[PDB]
């Protein structure tokens, strides 16, 4: 029945919105009532919804115009924002007033919020993050910038046919976006190759080709406070002039279809989660956000009170107390080169004045330990690109490796691993020694990433600079991620504790004067009973299912990679399925185990891993003997939106990590605060969760960091593993046997070869424990009232896991800034 | 000061639009007032202009669904419409109480109305044609359907640096389109390649690729009579399925970067005026438009009041009297082989019942006489990308071919000619027999045009159908060449005779009992005088000038083209230029001559002859012996707005093709309505013109058509004229001395050489008489009241070259459909 705090169905602003949407119809949609389909309708209520957003968005800017704030910029390669929607009307307080308006219209608002595209703009965990990081700005009243890439294409839509991934294209943009707003008015050109003259006073970088970047901006509003900040997402253009001009006479028309080969460079994201590819068009977008960007912060600088104030030089030294920009991970590393370009070369200050600019403006978040994700770019391929970047990143290189002599007298060896130039056999640079060495910070996503970033891969740089390394633990916004996804648990605390609490997560605390109050578990467990029954039946509507919704909901969904162990919890899968074979009629608890996530195309073994999950739900679905007991499923297409319909209606999170490998992760969080209960190892943010609600109010197993350091030192060998259980070499026997792949037996040794032979990721040296502990999982769940008494000490201890908290950690340990709660007066206009 | 009826501004009409405009800054262009630029104020004007139109349009549309029509398509390739917003407010009387308005909120309408960018979606004449008749479909009421392409670059902007063209692309979308609307909604599938299987009962087209059409739709709105037409526009887009499905497996993001080969069907415009290019790209777009169009067509007839009725089959055999379809040119030929095969491979009709369905729906418009403008298709060409289509081709050339032979017993030489496919090394397939063969009607665009296709190029069509052949001649429309270039005129006329003339043009004959009337003779001099003051001043601020506006402004303005013989004006301004150089004290008539117009790029000549007017402006305009007596001026980017800038200010209208080449002409008729007299051959529409105002209030000179052929027959040789004129013989050793090239002295011998050797287009033999009947121009420009008599009995007689008679011809006697001048009830809604 809903009708939550979804705010207030105003008989006014219900009247008005009722009004305006039908105006849009008409005057923006061009389609009359006998003629609209849903699709018309959601674009109408879009349209409607975001003309309550514009006075805001442009007072907001106004108001940081004349108030001149410091500025926050946030580089990021990827956000991850999914659908705008109900996000805003969460925001805006809207949400109960436009349901009533599309009621009394007689239209089903939840039903034109499923007509919207997300926006999958990123990959998974690093975009997330930028896009819940933008929340938090705006929530916190800060003047903060978010800037990327406006890809047509975000990441493609995953289909599985015959159990396979099949990619498609992600068209996004076919139908419009009404969230957007393209100003092509503020335009600004890069420039790309060219070559390097030295002449009398200094360096030029001539001849280059010219891509010019087009602005789109989005709104971002915060929540209930009449913040709306921007995201300004560039768009690739080709110049009017070369593309025809000089004697490029190779054909005029065959001249006009090759502003394509420019216009490529925001075509399409990469699809690839924590693996770096050199590849050129990688660099070209890399490089791209970085130079539109810096014009477009050097110009809000001069032009900002400044642009009053002569009586010497522009003063860059005030730029870092005007600007601050953050680094999301190293893919905007070459913001430091290009800050030191313009202000060296351009702006012809002293190359010693630019660098300190440089450092106390920047501060960079590495989010993987992991080797295959780090970036080291191939020179050749720089000095083609960017030869003015090449000889400034070998000016900083000396200067800095200089420091590092002078301080460690004779380490010759320290020398050459603090090197940003990998001496090898293809001379490379290492883009995040770049990144520590023009950050005043360098920080990680959890505590015990941090740690192991300050104690193996950066120790060096931490000896030498100390006070750069800092912690950040990573944060989810309990707007989208409680409100929005899952109104009814928002209900029923905000029912006993109040709302103050989606602005100040911490509140939730509160809510453990009701573990023991029984009131409160019948609503805990009840909410948590709708959500399924509502994702039982999603699944059999949109995608024919019968899945049990009496059953534990076991799910992981996340990126599909060997470290996450989606295989751990494969072997999970048939051990439990055997045990039902062998012992039949012996009670167990049922379950329904969902597993989803998105596979890079190429990345093989994580291909034949989605392969895998669905050849072992052909045969556990099928087997007349198991029956409701057990059901395993393949979720398709993972992405923001299925994760705010997944997350809600889940019993058990799967965070099984190798321990070291999973730097924070955030899904994490989502599942915590959504009422599941967490089964991991003590990796990433997991740590600090299990010491929020209490080791034994979560299910630990597993290696912890220094066992998997003991057995790398002893050498991991599984062969003593399959030899020790038994369980688990019938597992392996099945599967070379051929008994998940009839026809073709011999599919799956690739994995049996990786798991027997080269596994990174130890699964079968966690095996025992990781069954054992889920044997304790199934234990509670049998007892109702317990399970979700220990579901309330973790929902009630989530508080620390808000974005808002990491945000006002950023702002203050690193940006220099301060977090505002209030209210932007934002009303608007009146005239007549 | 204007305030002409430009409608009025009603105190309550313009406190609607301030309000409404101010709207649209805010909440469509998110800008505030000290913030926007004249751009945004250009756009908030535009989107409120477009507000007042959308009931109408949705009405118009909603009145034909229910009143079902007999509805014309008019498929052309070209449509060149040129900028809309003046236009609308023309059309729909809003020009006062918008300037009123605009007043008001402080902005100068007419500088706004300069931000807009032409749709330059044609090439000249046939395009601009395509545009005036949509204008005049509206006007008449008739339910009619323009169908193109939505190119994203136009026709280029010619810029001439150093005195040559040089082309640039025409990026027209790049600030937004107001005036579409995106209805990706109704997309469609077009195929291209795949193989013929004929199977079981027939034939069937077999794996072929998949580009989508996506509509684009603008409104036309009929002068001041609430109808409110469509143009639709197709765009490609790629499937997103095979582009990376099947096994492409060449990169997932290649795949995807790839999309851009089917994008590019509807990139650009090809820039050829009046020649033929036999370019798989424009066998592409020609295909692409018939099918995308075809389908549209045909599921409006199924469901339009036949979707209710049943009791038989589908019947098409009430198709011709639902749709007519008029062919612009044989660029859209492809509808007579698709019609064919939907009709017999799709519906399953019978051949000859499909045939006959063809005929009486299609008909075709002929445009030229060259033969290098004719399309002839290479059939290797066709049966890669169309290999259905080419079957049909063929099996319809068989039929045909056995009516011929039928009535033409034994000529063998008939059979071969009148062949569809012209037998030779590369075979090809000849689209005009194609076209005459599939309609039911055929029609030149003057009259003397269409009598040269009924006695040559069409002889042997004509004696087997004399029935299939027509004339239309062509028509220019009152409302943007009168009224809206011209308000001055339009006021004086109007103040003398009243308005009811814009939608009936004939009326223009009242004007004649004002011919001897000395207040109406100071009035048509006076306006002529202001425009040209006005056009004066627009050079030298636009593009820096001093020309002298007391002089006779001279001008030929149309695309670069031999036959068309700018180089015949070039030798009439050199020898002028060189009687003043001997007899510098003799007094003369001064002139400003401009010639202006675009160049296909790789039409060598046709780029020689921009170069030889600009270098003979580069002597001339440098003499200090010649002073304000002659001016020569290249006038670069002509185009659509530039012409409404002007033939308004023009003095003499040069329309010198050699007798025969220009089919009809329109700038012929801009001009005689605008108050110029014509300078001209017997050739086209100038020969009705003169039948209409007096061969004696025109100045025709040169070679009737009778007088080429008597030449050719003879042999032209042009060694005999610059044997027996020194005048001549003198320019041309200039052009060859490097009179005119100073530091290349044979630059210019290329155009000297064809003159000389091999001149299709006999410049020498009218240059007599040219230079002859130039002398009586300025004989009676000398006498002021005179020259303005006779403008006065030109545009007293220019009624017959209104586009509203032309398309009241087509509609009677070739689409059998009816014209009304009443006025749509369209108002709109009101509740509360
Ligand atoms: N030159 C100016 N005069 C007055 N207001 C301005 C000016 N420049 C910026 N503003 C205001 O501040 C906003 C900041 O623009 P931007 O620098 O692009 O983020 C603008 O949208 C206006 O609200
Ligand atoms: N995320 C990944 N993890 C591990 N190996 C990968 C991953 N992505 C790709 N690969 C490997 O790296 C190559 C380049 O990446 P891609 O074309 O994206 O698969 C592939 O051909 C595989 O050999
Ligand atoms: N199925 C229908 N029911 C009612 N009105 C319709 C229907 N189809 C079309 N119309 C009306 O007629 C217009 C014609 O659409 P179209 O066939 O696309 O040119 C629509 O925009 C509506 O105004
Ligand atoms: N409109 C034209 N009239 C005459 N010759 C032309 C024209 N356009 C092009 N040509 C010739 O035809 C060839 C193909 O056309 P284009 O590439 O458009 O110049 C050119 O290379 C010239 O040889
Ligand atoms: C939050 C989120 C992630 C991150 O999940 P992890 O378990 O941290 O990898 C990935 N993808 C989606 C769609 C998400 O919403
Ligand atoms: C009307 C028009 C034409 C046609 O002029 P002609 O003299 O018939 O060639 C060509 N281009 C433009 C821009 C026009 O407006």
């Given at each position: 029945?809903?009708?939550?705090?979804?705010?207030?169905?105003?008989?006014?602003?219900?009247?008005?919105?009722?009004?305006?949407?039908?105006?849009?119809?008409?005057?923006?949609?061009?389609?009359?009532?006998?003629?609209?389909?849903?699709?018309?309708?959601?674009?109408?209520?879009?349209?409607?919804?975001?003309?309550?957003?514009?006075?805001?968005w442009?007072?907001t800017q106004?108001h940081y115009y004349?108030k001149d704030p410091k500025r926050i910029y946030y580089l990021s390669?990827?956000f991850?924002?999914?659908?705008?929607?109900?996000?805003?009307?969460?925001?805006?307080?809207?949400?109960?007033?436009?349901?009533?308006?599309?009621?009394?219209?007689?239209?089903?608002?939840?039903?034109?919020?499923?007509?919207?595209?997300?926006?999958?703009?990123?990959?998974?965990?690093?975009?997330?993050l930028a896009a819940c990081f933008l929340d938090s700005m705006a929530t916190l009243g800060l003047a903060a910038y978010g800037y990327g890439?406006?890809?047509?294409?975000?990441?493609?839509?995953?289909?599985?046919?015959?159990?396979?991934?099949?990619?498609?294209?992600?068209?996004?943009?076919?139908?419009?976006?009404?969230?957007?707003?393209?100003?092509?008015?503020?335009?600004?050109?890069?420039?790309?190759?060219?070559?390097?003259?030295?002449?009398?006073?200094?360096?030029?970088?001539?001849?280059?080709?010219?891509?010019?970047?087009?602005?789109?901006d989005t709104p971002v509003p915060g929540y209930?406070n009449?913040v709306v900040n921007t995201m300004r997402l560039?768009?690739?253009?080709?110049?009017?002039?070369?593309?025809?001009?000089?004697?490029?006479?190779?054909?005029?028309?065959?001249?006009?279809?090759?502003?394509?080969?420019?216009?490529?460079?925001?075509?399409?994201?990469?699809?690839?989660?924590?693996?770096?590819?050199?590849?050129?068009?990688?660099?070209?977008?890399?490089?791209?956000?970085?130079?539109?960007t810096?014009?477009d912060i050097?110009?809000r600088?001069?032009?900002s009170?400044?642009?009053?104030?002569?009586?010497?030089?522009?003063?860059?030294?005030?730029?870092?107390?005007k600007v601050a920009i953050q680094l999301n991970?190293?893919?905007?590393?070459?913001?430091?080169?290009?800050?030191?370009?313009?202000?060296?070369?351009?702006?012809?200050?002293?190359?010693?004045?630019?660098?300190?600019?440089?450092?106390?403006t920047?501060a960079?978040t590495?989010?993987?330990?992991?080797?295959?994700?780090?970036?080291?770019?191939?020179?050749?391929?720089?000095?083609?690109?960017?030869?003015?970047?090449?000889?400034?990143?070998?000016?900083?290189?000396?200067?800095?490796?200089?420091?590092?002599?002078?301080?460690?007298?004779?380490?010759?060896?320290?020398?050459?691993?603090?090197?940003?130039?990998?001496?090898?056999?293809?001379?490379?640079?290492?883009?995040?020694?770049?990144?520590?060495?023009?950050?005043?910070?360098?920080?990680?996503?959890?505590?015990?990433?941090?740690?192991?970033?300050?104690?193996?891969?950066?120790?060096?740089?931490?000896?030498?600079?100390?006070?750069?390394?800092?912690?950040?633990?990573?944060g989810?916004t309990?707007?989208?991620?409680?409100?929005?996804?899952?109104?009814?648990?928002?209900?029923?605390?905000?029912?006993?504790?109040?709302?103050?609490?989606?602005?100040?997560?911490?509140?939730?605390?509160?809510?453990?004067?009701?573990?023991?109050?029984?009131?409160?578990?019948?609503?805990?467990?009840?909410?948590?009973?709708?959500?399924?029954?509502?994702?039982?039946?999603?699944?059999?509507?949109?995608?024919?299912?019968?899945?049990?919704?009496?059953?534990?909901?076991?799910?992981?969904?996340?990126?599909?990679?060997?470290?996450?162990?989606?295989?751990?919890?494969?072997?999970?899968?048939?051990?439990?399925?055997?045990?039902?074979?062998?012992?039949?009629?012996?009670?167990?608890?049922?379950?329904?185990?969902?597993?989803?996530?998105?596979?890079?195309?190429?990345?093989?073994?994580?291909?034949?891993?989605?392969?895998?999950?669905?050849?072992?739900?052909?045969?556990?679905?099928?087997?007349?003997?198991?029956?409701?007991?057990?059901?395993?499923?393949?979720?398709?297409?993972?992405?923001?939106?299925?994760?705010?319909?997944?997350?809600?209606?889940?019993?058990?999170?799967?965070?099984?990590?190798?321990?070291?490998?999973?730097?924070?992760?955030?899904?994490?969080?989502?599942?915590?605060?959504?009422?599941?209960?967490?089964?991991?190892?003590?990796?990433?943010?997991?740590?600090?969760?299990?010491?929020?609600?209490?080791?034994?109010?979560?299910?630990?197993?597993?290696?912890?960091?220094?066992?998997?350091?003991?057995?790398?030192?002893?050498?991991?060998?599984?062969?003593?593993?399959?030899?020790?259980?038994?369980?688990?070499?019938?597992?392996?026997?099945?599967?070379?046997?051929?008994?998940?792949?009839?026809?073709?037996?011999?599919?799956?040794?690739?994995?049996?070869?990786?798991?027997?032979?080269?596994?990174?990721?130890?699964?079968?040296?966690?095996?025992?424990?990781?069954?054992?502990?889920?044997?304790?999982?199934?234990?509670?769940?049998?007892?109702?009232?317990?399970?979700?008494?220990?579901?309330?000490?973790?929902?009630?201890?989530?508080?620390?896991?808000?974005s808002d908290?990491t945000i006002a950690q950023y702002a203050r340990?690193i940006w220099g800034v301060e977090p505002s709660?209030?209210?932007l007066?934002?009303?608007?206009?009146?005239?007549?």
């Amino acid at each position: 029945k809903q009708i939550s705090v979804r705010g207030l169905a105003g008989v006014e602003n219900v009247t008005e919105l009722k009004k305006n949407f039908n105006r849009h119809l008409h005057f923006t949609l061009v389609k009359d009532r006998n003629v609209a389909t849903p699709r018309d309708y959601y674009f109408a209520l879009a349209h409607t919804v975001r003309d309550h957003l514009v006075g805001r968005w442009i007072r907001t800017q106004q108001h940081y115009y004349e108030k001149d704030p410091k500025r926050i910029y946030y580089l990021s390669l990827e956000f991850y924002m999914g659908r705008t929607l109900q996000n805003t009307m969460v925001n805006l307080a809207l949400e109960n007033a436009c349901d009533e308006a599309t009621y009394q219209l007689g239209l089903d608002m939840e039903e034109l919020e499923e007509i919207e595209e997300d926006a999958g703009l990123g990959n998974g965990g690093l975009g997330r993050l930028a896009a819940c990081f933008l929340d938090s700005m705006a929530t916190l009243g800060l003047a903060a910038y978010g800037y990327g890439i406006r890809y047509e294409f975000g990441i493609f839509n995953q289909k599985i046919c015959g159990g396979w991934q099949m990619e498609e294209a992600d068209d996004w943009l076919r139908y419009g976006n009404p969230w957007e707003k393209a100003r092509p008015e503020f335009t600004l050109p890069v420039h790309f190759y060219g070559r390097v003259e030295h002449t009398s006073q200094g360096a030029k970088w001539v001849d280059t080709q010219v891509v010019l970047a087009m602005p789109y901006d989005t709104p971002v509003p915060g929540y209930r406070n009449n913040v709306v900040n921007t995201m300004r997402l560039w768009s690739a253009k080709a110049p009017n002039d070369f593309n025809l001009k000089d004697f490029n006479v190779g054909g005029y028309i065959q001249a006009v279809l090759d502003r394509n080969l420019a216009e490529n460079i925001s075509r399409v994201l990469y699809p690839n989660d924590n693996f770096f590819e050199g590849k050129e068009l990688r660099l070209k977008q890399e490089y791209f956000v970085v130079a539109a960007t810096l014009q477009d912060i050097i110009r809000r600088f001069k032009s900002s009170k400044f642009g009053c104030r002569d009586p010497v030089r522009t003063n860059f030294d005030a730029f870092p107390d005007k600007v601050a920009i953050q680094l999301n991970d190293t893919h905007p590393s070459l913001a430091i080169p290009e800050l030191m370009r313009v202000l060296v070369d351009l702006e012809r200050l002293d190359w010693d004045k630019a660098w300190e600019v440089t450092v106390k403006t920047c501060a960079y978040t590495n989010h993987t330990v992991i080797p295959e994700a780090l970036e080291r770019w191939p020179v050749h391929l720089l000095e083609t690109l960017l030869p003015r970047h090449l000889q400034i990143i070998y000016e900083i290189n000396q200067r800095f490796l200089n420091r590092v002599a002078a301080a460690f007298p004779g380490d010759v060896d320290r020398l050459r691993r603090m090197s940003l130039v990998e001496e090898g056999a293809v001379k490379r640079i290492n883009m995040a020694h770049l990144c520590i060495a023009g950050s005043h910070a360098v920080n990680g996503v959890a505590r015990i990433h941090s740690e192991i970033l300050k104690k193996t891969i950066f120790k060096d740089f931490y000896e030498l600079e100390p006070h750069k390394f800092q912690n950040k633990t990573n944060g989810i916004t309990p707007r989208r991620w409680l409100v929005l996804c899952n109104p009814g648990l928002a209900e029923i605390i905000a029912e006993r504790i109040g709302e103050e609490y989606i602005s100040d997560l911490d509140q939730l605390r509160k809510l453990l004067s009701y573990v023991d109050d029984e009131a409160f578990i019948r609503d805990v467990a009840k909410v948590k009973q709708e959500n399924k029954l509502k994702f039982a039946a999603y699944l059999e509507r949109e995608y024919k299912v019968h899945i049990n919704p009496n059953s534990l909901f076991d799910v992981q969904v996340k990126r599909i990679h060997e470290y996450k162990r989606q295989l751990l919890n494969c072997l999970h899968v048939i051990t439990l399925y055997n045990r039902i074979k062998k012992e039949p009629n012996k009670f167990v608890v049922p379950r329904t185990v969902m597993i989803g996530g998105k596979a890079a195309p190429g990345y093989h073994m994580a291909k034949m891993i989605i392969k895998l999950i669905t050849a072992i739900g052909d045969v556990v679905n099928h087997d007349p003997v198991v029956g409701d007991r057990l059901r395993v499923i393949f979720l398709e297409n993972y992405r923001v939106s299925l994760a705010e319909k997944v997350i809600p209606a889940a019993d058990l999170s799967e965070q099984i990590s190798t321990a070291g490998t999973e730097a924070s992760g955030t899904g994490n969080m989502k599942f915590m605060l959504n009422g599941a209960l967490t089964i991991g190892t003590m990796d990433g943010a997991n740590v600090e969760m299990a010491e929020e609600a209490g080791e034994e109010n979560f299910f630990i197993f597993g290696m912890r960091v220094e066992d998997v350091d003991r057995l790398d030192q002893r050498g991991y060998n599984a062969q003593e593993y399959y030899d020790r259980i038994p369980e688990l070499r019938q597992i392996i026997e099945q599967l070379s046997s051929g008994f998940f792949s009839p026809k073709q037996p011999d599919l799956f040794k690739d994995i049996v070869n990786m798991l027997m032979h080269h596994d990174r990721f130890k699964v079968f040296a966690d095996y025992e424990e990781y069954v054992k502990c889920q044997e304790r999982v199934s234990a509670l769940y049998k007892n109702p009232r317990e399970w979700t008494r220990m579901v309330i000490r973790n929902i009630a201890t989530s508080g620390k896991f808000s974005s808002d908290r990491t945000i006002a950690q950023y702002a203050r340990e690193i940006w220099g800034v301060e977090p505002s709660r209030q209210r932007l007066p934002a009303p608007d206009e009146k005239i007549p």
